[PDB]
Design a protein around this ligand. Structure first.
Ligand SMILES: [Mn+2]
Ligand SMILES: [Mn+2]
Lengths: 413, 413
């Protein structure tokens, strides 16, 4: 090789679990470190270390991200009963993503990584679609509980200024059941709106925001009102100028509209809807492994790029048996590239920016050239008609191919 | 002569709004009344009458349904700010569907009405999919509010038996925002589970139930636990016997799995998810107008069949100008057939059951023969390449074709 790109500021690195943790290291050693001299503020968010630090490492990584402005995160495990037993956890630690997002705040933008040779499950989507998932509140910062006997469920709001408090009787349970309370803030919703309007303008695409305000008149109505107010005051002039538009839509009408569309728009989703619908989008364009996920804070300075899929336990078990696997690392690679690209933009480091964009292009070109992992090969020839080294490559070999293609792309620059 | 089929018990009829209200009457006059002598317990749920009765007519229709066991419902308008002004409403009346479902309870089963010549937007779904939407609680019976200043949001649960009350601080608002509380009951969830397991066995199909219990551990965990408990105690023996299975899945994993599947399964959805995902299914199979929606109550005797799509305001405006339209009446027709079929099953009226099933088959055969409304014609030739009487027919003419085909079919019997 030659000189490695010098990076003036550090990048926060959040290590993850199982198979994703394994390929994360492969990516670091084969594609990043050899070409980039970056200081990494390492935080092991692997389940074992979270348990050892009583989940404090998760909070620490979020604070570090605020300080340094950029973080790249590896997929992690959100503990359930079985995981508690498997890892002998002292507590069923809450979702680290939820914790990080709550601290940083913002919008998680998700878009498909388009490869011309990968078949879409929804033929009609000829253009990409971007989802802006509000990353704060609602079901992810809720208080839920089980009721085991008849009783009254009420809510009390007590003003800090000392003004008259208010109460609501949510329900008088005749017997057992469940209850929950959730919230969101005008401040968080506003930041969410601004980020989405700005993204739509950058893309020169229309923007749609979905809710079910016909049912949750106050809660969802707030989202609708704030979006419209912010639109009229700050973005309508530009939207009209660029011949795009902004429209609120009821969630059920919206999902049908999207499925029947040809894509080419930004879709602002509440936290829960963003979670559910982004997986429909990823799968619809071809694969869950072909999607980027970047948390953009309202400050327009801080971001957290992540691999938003599972930890591929199946493959991990094989890896533990000393066997190679064919795990798609593309999503993890884009977490690194989006992070390095932002680091470069903040520092005005053109070489780093060019490196990140080059690696992303090389990933797509590599797949389009026919080199890919088993999952993608299956999407083309059928999950039951693909043979190793014939239709797909194992993770390590796939990465070596990317590395080769990368050097070539950089050499011709 | 009067050869109408005699019906011994009444059927509750819930009239609706705008264009659906118009075609509802066409259906009654052209397809139902000429062939069936049924006593209809009429309730006008049109927005104007709901306003006139302070929405009491909605409750009255639900009580009638409990009494007579069968209701057929026309699509209605759920009032928003614009509707309040348009209809000069004294109040923004809540969703009548939510009101009826809360009173009756149960599961809303939704399935596509498959026509061989209508293209799917999701090619992979070679077999139908049925969604069992829990019809009670959650967001549809929630208490939501806007917070306009700093203050504490807390929840208090006070047991009736005098045992220790419980309190939770949901959030301390630093400024303005929104808050809400929602609930569900063990009883309602259990009825929902039973209906879905029974439906899967009737279909000889696997059953999947989705939640996000990794986040809402108590609330969603309750659904997961109750389903598993009921499965093991009442249905595992039959599922094993018929080689089918029951599995819980996280909602985001589930939607991706569904999109990539070939269909052929029952999907139990929480109220909200059922609402959103049923529109994706309807659109995915071809059209929002090609879907049945039947509320099956916990008592295993009461049902409410409805046309679950919009009121087609656009076409209604044209109708008001004395102009004919090409509005798809199939969903509304199936509301009547599913209702009459159940009436027949309860009364042991074979002729009525045969009539209902014959009419459903005739509708499908008619569309497959090439006779259809503009929306379906567009799905085949393209919304911008269809000509009246060439590729599609206006509503009245389409209904006349169905009537003609129906008589021919009933005659062969
Ligand atoms: Mn997700
Ligand atoms: Mn709906």
């Amino acid at each position: 090789a030659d000189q490695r790109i010098k990076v003036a500021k550090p990048v926060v690195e959040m290590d993850g679990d199982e198979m994703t943790r394994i390929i994360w290291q492969f990516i670091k050693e084969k594609l990043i470190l050899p070409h980039v001299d970056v200081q990494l503020k390492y935080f092991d968010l692997g389940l074992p270390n979270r348990d050892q630090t009583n989940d404090q490492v998760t909070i620490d990584s979020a604070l570090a991200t605020q300080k340094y402005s950029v973080a790249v995160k590896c997929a992690t495990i959100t503990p359930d009963e079985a995981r508690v037993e498997e890892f002998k956890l002292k507590k069923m630690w809450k979702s680290p993503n939820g914790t990080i997002r709550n601290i940083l705040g913002g919008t998680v933008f998700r878009e498909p990584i388009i490869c011309k040779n990968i078949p879409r499950l929804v033929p009609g989507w000829t253009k990409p679609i971007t989802i802006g998932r509000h990353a704060h509140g609602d079901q992810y910062k809720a208080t839920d509980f089980v009721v085991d006997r008849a009783g009254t469920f009420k809510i009390v709001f007590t003003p800090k200024d000392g003004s008259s408090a208010k109460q609501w009787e949510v329900y008088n349970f005749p017997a057992g059941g469940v209850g929950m309370g959730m919230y969101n803030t005008d401040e968080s919703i506003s930041g969410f709106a601004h980020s989405c309007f700005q993204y739509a303008i950058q893309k020169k695409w229309p923007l749609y925001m979905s809710t079910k305000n016909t049912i949750l008149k106050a809660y969802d109505g707030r989202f609708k009102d704030i979006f419209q107010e912010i639109f009229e005051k700050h973005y309508k002039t530009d939207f009209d100028k660029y011949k795009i538009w902004y429209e609120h839509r009821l969630i059920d009408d919206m999902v049908a509209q999207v499925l029947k569309s040809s894509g080419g728009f930004v879709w602002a989703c509440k936290n829960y809807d963003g979670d559910v619908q982004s997986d429909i989008l990823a799968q619809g364009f071809g694969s869950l492994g072909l999607m980027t996920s970047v948390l953009v804070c309202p400050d327009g300075k801080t971001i957290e790029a992540e691999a938003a899929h599972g930890t591929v336990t199946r493959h991990y078990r094989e890896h533990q048996k000393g066997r190679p696997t064919s795990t798609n690392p593309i999503a993890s690679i884009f977490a690194w590239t989006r992070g390095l690209e932002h680091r470069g933009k903040l520092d005005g480091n053109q070489d780093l920016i060019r490196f990140a964009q080059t690696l992303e292009k090389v990933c797509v070109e590599t797949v389009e050239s026919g080199a890919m992992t088993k999952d993608l090969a299956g999407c083309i020839h059928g999950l039951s008609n693909v043979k190793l080294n014939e239709h797909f490559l194992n993770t390590s070999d796939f990465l070596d191919t990317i590395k080769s293609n990368l050097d070539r792309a950089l050499g011709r620059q």
